[PDB]
Amino acid sequence: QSWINDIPFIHSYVLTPAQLGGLSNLQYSRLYTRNIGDPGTTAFAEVKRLEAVGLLGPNIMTNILTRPPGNGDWASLCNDPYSFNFESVASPSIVLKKHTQRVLFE
Amino acid sequence: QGLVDTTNTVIKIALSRKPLGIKRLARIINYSSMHAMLFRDDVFLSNRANHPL
Incomplete structure (x- = not known):
């Protein structure tokens, strides 16, 4: 009930890229070519453009760079590169898929 | 292990x-x-008094 009526929060949340914790899976460069390349530089480049043109505030660029880190293993770095070690919650598809694999193979 | 067909019935x-x-x-x-x-x-409502280089 708190955050759903914060309209600049919903703006700044559906528009921040999904690599950085937001919702947006459509960078502007996705509209011209496919998803090839580094995801992280595309995320930070879109955040840079959206800050430049005045959509997204200057708060968010300072806060993403100063973000406290997540857990991380060497296995978490190796099983997925291009991966910022931020504290992030796990997708239910990944959790349930991996649980069903590790149950059926017992 | 990533070749199993995890449908909703399997889950x-x-x-x-x-x-x-x-x-x-x-x-x-x-x-x-x-x-x-x-x-x-983390990223929307934060002070972050340190400003990086």
């Missing part, structure tokens, strides 16, 4: 074999609100 069968957990199931149900609050507390 219900494997949950009927072994239940998920207590902390993980609370994270599965509350996923959208926890994701939104994590975005809110």
Whole structure:
């Protein structure tokens, strides 16, 4: 009930890229070519453009760079590169898929 | 292991074999609100008096 009526929060949340914790899976460069390349530089480049043109505030660029880190293993770095070690919650598809694999193979 | 056909029926069968957990199931149900609050507390609503180089 708190955050759903914060309209600049919903703006700044559906528009921040999904690599950085937001919702947006459509960078502007996705509209011209496919998803090839580094995801992280595309995320930070879109955040840079959206800050430049005045959509997204200057708060968010300072806060993403100063973000406290997540857990991380060497296995978490190796099983997925291009991966910022931020504290992030796990997708239910990944959790349930991996649980069903590790149950059926017992 | 990434070649199994995890449909919803397969997932219900494997949950009927072994239940998920207590902390993980609370994270599965509350996923959208926890994701939104994590975005809110980390990158939208923060002081961050250190400014990096």
